[PDB]
Design an enzyme around this catalytic site. Structure first.
Site, PDB file in Angstrom:
ATOM      1  N   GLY A   1      -3.125 -18.161   8.509  1.00 39.58           N
ATOM      2  CA  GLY A   1      -3.462 -18.825   7.345  1.00 39.58           C
ATOM      3  C   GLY A   1      -2.977 -17.723   6.287  1.00 39.58           C
ATOM      4  O   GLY A   1      -2.499 -16.708   6.166  1.00 39.58           O
TER       5      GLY A   1
ATOM      6  N   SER B   1      -2.067 -14.310  14.002  1.00 43.71           N
ATOM      7  CA  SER B   1      -2.004 -14.010  12.623  1.00 43.71           C
ATOM      8  C   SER B   1      -3.533 -13.602  12.101  1.00 43.71           C
ATOM      9  O   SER B   1      -4.290 -12.842  12.888  1.00 43.71           O
ATOM     10  CB  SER B   1      -1.197 -14.890  11.686  1.00 43.71           C
ATOM     11  OG  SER B   1      -1.525 -14.763  10.244  1.00 43.71           O
ATOM     12  N   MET B   2      -3.967 -14.240  10.948  1.00 48.89           N
ATOM     13  CA  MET B   2      -5.350 -13.878  10.392  1.00 48.89           C
ATOM     14  C   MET B   2      -6.459 -14.185  11.496  1.00 48.89           C
ATOM     15  O   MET B   2      -7.387 -13.571  11.382  1.00 48.89           O
ATOM     16  CB  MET B   2      -5.615 -14.320   9.152  1.00 48.89           C
ATOM     17  CG  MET B   2      -4.712 -14.009   7.905  1.00 48.89           C
ATOM     18  SD  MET B   2      -4.861 -12.298   7.839  1.00 48.89           S
ATOM     19  CE  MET B   2      -6.398 -12.290   7.203  1.00 48.89           C
TER      20      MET B   2
ATOM     21  N   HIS C   1       1.161 -10.217  15.142  1.00 47.73           N
ATOM     22  CA  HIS C   1       2.240 -10.289  14.177  1.00 47.73           C
ATOM     23  C   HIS C   1       2.254 -11.222  13.148  1.00 47.73           C
ATOM     24  O   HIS C   1       1.582 -12.288  13.321  1.00 47.73           O
ATOM     25  CB  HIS C   1       3.606 -10.514  14.902  1.00 47.73           C
ATOM     26  CG  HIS C   1       4.711 -10.994  14.277  1.00 47.73           C
ATOM     27  ND1 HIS C   1       5.715 -10.028  13.873  1.00 47.73           N
ATOM     28  CD2 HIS C   1       5.245 -12.057  14.063  1.00 47.73           C
ATOM     29  CE1 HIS C   1       6.525 -10.542  13.146  1.00 47.73           C
ATOM     30  NE2 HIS C   1       6.353 -11.789  13.249  1.00 47.73           N
TER      31      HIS C   1
ATOM     32  N   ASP D   1       7.383  -9.710  17.500  1.00 50.52           N
ATOM     33  CA  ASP D   1       7.004 -11.403  17.535  1.00 50.52           C
ATOM     34  C   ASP D   1       6.750 -11.800  18.977  1.00 50.52           C
ATOM     35  O   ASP D   1       7.622 -12.384  19.512  1.00 50.52           O
ATOM     36  CB  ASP D   1       8.145 -12.076  16.996  1.00 50.52           C
ATOM     37  CG  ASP D   1       7.908 -13.304  16.467  1.00 50.52           C
ATOM     38  OD1 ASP D   1       7.308 -14.217  17.314  1.00 50.52           O
ATOM     39  OD2 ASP D   1       8.138 -14.042  15.667  1.00 50.52           O
TER      40      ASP D   1
END
Ligand SMILES: O=c1c2c(c3cccnc3n1Cc1ccc(Cl)cc1)CCN(Cc1cccc(Cl)c1)C2
Ligand SMILES: O=c1c2c(c3cccnc3n1Cc1ccc(Cl)cc1)CCN(Cc1cccc(Cl)c1)C2
Ligand SMILES: O=c1c2c(c3cccnc3n1Cc1ccc(Cl)cc1)CCN(Cc1cccc(Cl)c1)C2
Ligand SMILES: O=c1c2c(c3cccnc3n1Cc1ccc(Cl)cc1)CCN(Cc1cccc(Cl)c1)C2
Ligand SMILES: O=c1c2c(c3cccnc3n1Cc1ccc(Cl)cc1)CCN(Cc1cccc(Cl)c1)C2
Ligand SMILES: O=c1c2c(c3cccnc3n1Cc1ccc(Cl)cc1)CCN(Cc1cccc(Cl)c1)C2
Ligand SMILES: O=c1c2c(c3cccnc3n1Cc1ccc(Cl)cc1)CCN(Cc1cccc(Cl)c1)C2
Ligand SMILES: O=c1c2c(c3cccnc3n1Cc1ccc(Cl)cc1)CCN(Cc1cccc(Cl)c1)C2
Ligand SMILES: O=c1c2c(c3cccnc3n1Cc1ccc(Cl)cc1)CCN(Cc1cccc(Cl)c1)C2
Lengths: 177, 175, 175, 176, 176, 172, 176, 175, 174
Positions: free
Chosen positions: D62, D91-92, D116, D156
């Protein structure tokens, strides 16, 4: 959401708690439903006491003219001295409520901006009948002659709390208690 | 929804209010300003000497609303502790810098922007901006020129960099 | 849609371009600016000596787009008659007053305004409006203080009062 | 809706999880959930700054500054923080998963991990400053080098829990 | 709205929870997966020996959300009675087949589909999850991978008995 | 909004009188709510009947069959009432009513015709799950059921008593 | 409604007539579709004569970066001298095109606004690689330092025509 | 808003098609594919040995549409010059790589990406199309499959020369 | 924007003059209408010279596909079908409907006969049968193989589709 405060026991939402302290905060756009909700609180508050002062917090950009006048008539009808407090902008009808406070008791915080200019379905005659009701309401309170009111309103500009004090819209510009 | 905490149980946000902690999360509008202002005045009435704590994680918002929060902060006798988490941009960084001197804090990885974002008469935009110059100059102890110049750069400051500019006082990693 | 007249046939606006008549109807933007500028340079190609008649019925628009038209009027050697019909507002009054001296016109019931209606920084909106102060003063013959103070008033002018100010030169009912 | 469990007080089941010092981070990370998680952690330290706090992570990532605010708060409070990746951590979210107390970062078998980054408005210079801020956080907890941390986040792809353990993002892949 | 029952008053759904019944009905997302995981961990705390009942009427959902529920099902020590009513498709039918061996039920007119429907992911990453579902299905249904891969290649539903012969459920019950 | 009676919500009342309202389009959310109600009233008694008020224009085929098999599973007798139109699945939940206890009001409308993502074969296997279900409860042959369901046509409560969809019609 | 002009009989629209004078009014926001028409018109004007000058009119707020570089590269590719003219405004990718004209042939009218500040889905490393492409191009044509270009472009402000001349973006400020 | 040129009158794009230039600018879908293929086949029947030029400025698009263009390029007998302007990402970079060897060009500031970004289809089908792209890329870049896979795994853009080193093009037009 | 060529026609009008019809996009009643109009017209010029059909389609409305299919079989011209890009659903049926020995595909196409997932069930089931028959007639496969191949949700390589019978030649260049 709206935060809840507790005291000793009963629990209050923050805006109901302010009302208990005799504070009515006109802090949004003025329309028929806001007028309804202010007038109810003002009437309730003199029912508590016709002499104990009542406090209004004014952070508004203006709104529907008849709704601001509904509030204005109520303020004048009720017997209590009313302290007007301008914390945000005081614009259009919001400035009219600010200047209508009990004389000597109309305040503003140092960084507010006040505007009497009204922004840009009815007839031209009716629009123009209402504009002069403001003139006279302003001339009554701002203590400026009708003509200079007119000149000041056609000017699309804001006032500082010091300017508004010189103009007669408000009485005291404080920074601290 | 919001979780509750306990004998009495309160939602977690009102619980922070019971601890004299005022959350200023998200964008600032007239709705947020009025709500913040009410709590500040409430907490001052319980004590004009215990400190107030503002948590600030805001991308900015309306200038008049942010100024309304600024003026209440100055008015109340309480010493106010501004805490920055995540970010404080536009009016957000102004409220943070308006904390009580020596009591303005940021966690290590936060981001601070005093640059304003890109309707009213052209002269009014200039008058409001110039009120920000004076307010920032008052609390960062910098000069107006410096303030203007730095506000002209579209960039973010690290907590370290914002401490050297005067926006805040402590970058606390740990208690 | 647009009617066609015979002379070969041509739509009725292209026919006005044959009579050296350029139309600025409605709001001004970058597309209108490119249309107006192209015709002005085209009509100068046909002859840099014969006049170009520019009709204006506009509430104004993008100020940088209007300036793009104003510079082009001043640039070309052709004298330019401006004719205000219906009403003029914002950038509209600028182009009207920017016509060649003595060839600024308006019809009886026109309705002129130099006040400007209410994403760039605060300072560049100032310099933009202050560019207009100087353009207005040069053509209306008024002092910057008279221009600046007048543009603060939110009101329209009569054609006769617009002539008294120096915006236009003749109020014609019929030639 | 939300079910109610009664213990006599009645709780929504999430508050009941918060009762046991369990903070749920399910779903995208934005400013509202960062506030709601930070308040939970700050409160749970008030309850006890010695008892461990358990943090459940099923998030696709996010807003970055919202994640950095949950990370900054995790390191501020004195309690040991056990992170638990169920479902996915991308992600985060995987940075919050990797930010647990050493030896206390776990993931479930079917828990996908991704460092990534997915590809208000900012300058270009500011997005690169934030990327390198993550470069330093990941390297600090995974013990890898900046060179390794940049190259890995260039790909990715998702990691299995054991591939993440081999990488330094988590410490225990539990079946039971 | 939601009716209330009295015993203290409960919404019907929170009443089914004190009976140790959890309802996985509707599309499976991260929100649904979060409640299901919470009720399951909560039910394990009241008693890790007494069976939990799951009701499945789902048309599928997010793969990682279904995996998060599945992993929670295996982690806890309670036996899990899965019940398919209406339909169980894709991730829905996976949870049904992931109940405790011998305790996977279905009502007479239910329908089962292991075919998958057709943050976005790379080609290599959708194939990795597709292969996890194979192994998960191969485990609880006792079929060869080669059987599972081909069966999911067909876009069709099965009967309860055909789901029984295939290994997804154990019992087709009309009455107690 | 929703009224209150002394204190409970009015819908929360009818359930205590062992009544369930299937009154609207049937989907998964209606199914669960309904089916949870049915399972709870059996916790009260497996013998005191459950009454079911039906005014539905149909809905998701799997959702109706979900309620259907629940009605069969629980032991209590179940009385179905077509207070309101019973189209498609509502008409289905009606035949499913305990033999002898399927009522309707006088001006009710009943239809078994199905209205005009799956494969082409699956819908057919579902259209035939329904054929067997009415043919079981209305005692009719599969042919007469298939031929009647081609007609985009409503029955009046007496007609459907002859068809076998319900048992009694009541004015009072 | 585009007016039509006639020559004798050949009827052009007002823009095709300007194209015939070797004048291309590249105004408005720059994207791929704008890029193409501009690329083609330039290429077509060189085929008629690789010696006669080409004129661009720039009244643009900017736009897609890769589209402006497509236009930029073609301006450099063609052997013709290019006279860029700024009327109204030229900001971000517009001002780059205005500075990309042939040395001693970049003009502006008295009231134009010029800005090199870039306004606020690709990785952070390559939004930065584009930004440095703009630095190099801006420094090649303005004959300023790289550092001077960088810090000048973080100031969110416009230039006057006579400051743009002092900076190196344009050469001549015409009133007649 | 599309200009016409004279030669005896063409819209400028058909003029380019007359010059044996085929534009592939914008996202690639079945409508782009059909129009590009029709122009390629038309240019072959006019002359099966004169070179054909493609102008690529594409972020990519549908894979099957791009493959329809790739196969047509391989089918026709003409040598095909590929020119990259602006960007060539995803299927755009494949069409660029699929030009006649020695005739693959790019302008200096262009960007090139072979990483595929993230009818709806099953998992086995994406990998089918994906492996199918691997083999086409190795086929023209002379790279090994192993290089192709890991390279496309990285989310990044190549310069025109780094892409020339890899085998996508042959020539960068430097000023 | 459609280019014009050289007596000046647009690129698509040019490809009809050359006895070519291209089904590039989803099939609906409007496409079928326009396709069938061309086929009957191309037969008007002559019903002996070949007609070339280009297919880059993901499918569409079944009746519209059957409307094109029936017209293909009605007209006497031999029809060379070409698949470029892909051919799925009714697209693969129009591809396989080409004249024997004159159904082609380029190397990187993908072909699917599976039908992706208002009327009653009997009516949809009945058009499935209809497709079952058309596929068995032109692939010359048995009905049994046909329907088992379309429950499978996958695409075929052009070479795989050749041994299935949907096309005749996989060619790279002439
Ligand atoms: O002021 C009144 C009024 C009325 C009233 C009637 C019965 C009991 N009390 C009443 N009071 C006192 C009160 C008690 C309780 C509360 Cl909560 C609030 C107020 C009737 C007339 N009305 C006139 C009025 C004034 C201003 C605005 C409007 Cl629109 C209308 C005032
Ligand atoms: O502080 C006040 C104020 C007022 C007041 C009036 C009557 C009773 N009390 C009052 N108190 C004490 C209080 C007790 C309890 C609560 Cl809950 C909240 C406040 C009126 C003046 N005003 C000034 C002000 C300062 C800053 C911002 C604004 Cl917008 C307004 C402050
Ligand atoms: O006026 C010009 C101009 C130029 C020009 C160049 C080559 C051939 N002619 C040219 N002409 C004559 C012409 C013939 C025919 C037509 Cl149709 C239109 C114009 C170039 C410079 N430019 C300056 C300018 C002034 C005002 C606004 C802008 Cl944005 C630009 C004017
Ligand atoms: O931890 C604190 C803090 C503060 C505080 C102030 C007054 C009363 N208590 C307080 N406590 C204990 C507490 C008990 C109960 C609850 Cl519900 C919440 C907190 C102020 C400083 N702050 C710093 C901080 C750290 C990390 C993130 C943020 Cl954003 C802010 C920590
Ligand atoms: O099960 C636990 C767990 C933990 C825990 C920690 C402190 C107190 N209790 C705890 N309990 C018991 C409990 C009591 C009450 C409730 Cl309401 C819910 C659960 C921590 C570890 N965690 C692991 C886990 C398993 C499966 C899925 C996930 Cl995502 C996470 C399980
Ligand atoms: O009937 C049951 C059932 C189960 C159950 C489990 C534990 C405790 N009780 C249970 N009871 C009695 C009960 C008590 C209390 C309440 Cl509130 C409601 C019901 C589990 C199996 N299930 C089967 C079922 C039938 C029809 C539809 C579905 Cl989807 C599922 C029935
Ligand atoms: O310039 C060319 C070019 C090519 C070309 C090929 C065949 C016939 N002519 C051609 N001409 C002359 C021409 C005639 C007619 C017109 Cl209308 C326009 C131009 C091919 C190479 N290309 C390179 C290029 C440069 C800049 C931008 C791009 Cl994207 C591409 C230039
Ligand atoms: O190339 C062809 C082709 C065919 C054809 C048929 C009749 C007349 N000419 C024809 N030509 C030359 C032509 C002249 C003029 C124009 Cl305008 C267009 C094309 C039929 C076969 N087809 C095969 C093909 C190759 C690549 C992609 C696809 Cl999808 C299809 C190529
Ligand atoms: O083929 C025909 C047909 C008819 C016809 C009638 C009058 C003149 N010609 C006609 N031709 C030759 C023609 C020349 C030129 C053109 Cl442009 C189009 C067609 C009438 C019958 N119809 C049957 C038909 C076959 C396939 C699909 C459909 Cl839907 C309908 C075929």
């Amino acid at each position: 959401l709206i935060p809840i405060v507790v005291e000793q026991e009963r629990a209050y939402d923050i805006y109901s708690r302010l009302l208990r302290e005799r504070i009515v905060c006109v802090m949004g756009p003025i329309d028929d439903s806001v007028a309804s909700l202010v007038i109810a609180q003002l009437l309730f508050l003199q029912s508590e006491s016709n002499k104990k002062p009542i406090h209004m917090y004014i952070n508004s950009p203006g709104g529907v003219v008849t709704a601001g006048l509904a509030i204005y008539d109520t303020m004048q009808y009720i017997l209590n001295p009313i302290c007007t407090w301008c914390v945000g902008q005081a614009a259009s009808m919001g400035s009219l409520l600010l200047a209508a406070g009990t004389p000597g008791m109309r305040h503003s915080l140092p960084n507010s901006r006040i505007m009497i200019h009204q922004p840009s379905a009815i007839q031209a005659e009716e629009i123009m009948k209402l504009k002069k009701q403001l003139y006279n309401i302003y001339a009554k309170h701002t203590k400026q002659s009708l003509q200079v009111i007119e000149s000041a309103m056609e000017r699309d500009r804001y006032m500082s709390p010091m300017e508004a004090q010189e103009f007669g819209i408000l009485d005291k510009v404080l920074v601290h208690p």
